Design a protein around this ligand. Sequence first.
Ligand SMILES: [Ca+2]
Ligand SMILES: [Ca+2]
Ligand SMILES: [Ca+2]
Ligand SMILES: [Ca+2]
Ligand code: NI
Lengths: 23, 139
Amino acid sequence: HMGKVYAALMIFDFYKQNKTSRD
Amino acid sequence: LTEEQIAEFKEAFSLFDKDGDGTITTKELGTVMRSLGQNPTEAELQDMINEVDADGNGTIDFPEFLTMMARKMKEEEIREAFRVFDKDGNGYISAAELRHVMTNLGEKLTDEEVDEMIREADIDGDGQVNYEEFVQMMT
Ligand SMILES: [Ca+2]
Ligand SMILES: [Ca+2]
Ligand SMILES: [Ca+2]
Ligand SMILES: [Ca+2]
Ligand code: NI
């Protein structure tokens, strides 16, 4: 039930892995 | 893999897939990222997708979505995730705090569902999720 949050956060964190800082 | 955890993945996929069309776009990713306090750029969103876009169609289907999760599975990020939920900074995610985030993600939850969720991540039984308990869940 808390599973869905876990998964959203994995994508959330995958986004973090893919960040590029300031122009 | 178990039935239950397929269902949870499926619920998560559906949180991202706001228009229900079975595919997640950069717009849908951006929208969820922003509802969680982030501010992704067009390029960042495209990179994320590109990393797991096995078929090069530019959108995320269900297996690619699982593959995103698998990759991240292979700390400072966890403290940040944590702060998204722990909004009064007190070190404990309450049920109301969990609810507030779920609502901002567009999820409709019964009181009982929210408590069930806190109860799954809660380890010491104090009825909230502290930081180390959030780490275990992310782990
Ligand atoms: Ca969609
Ligand atoms: Ca694709
Ligand atoms: Ca709190
Ligand atoms: Ca606890
Ligand atoms: Ni239920």
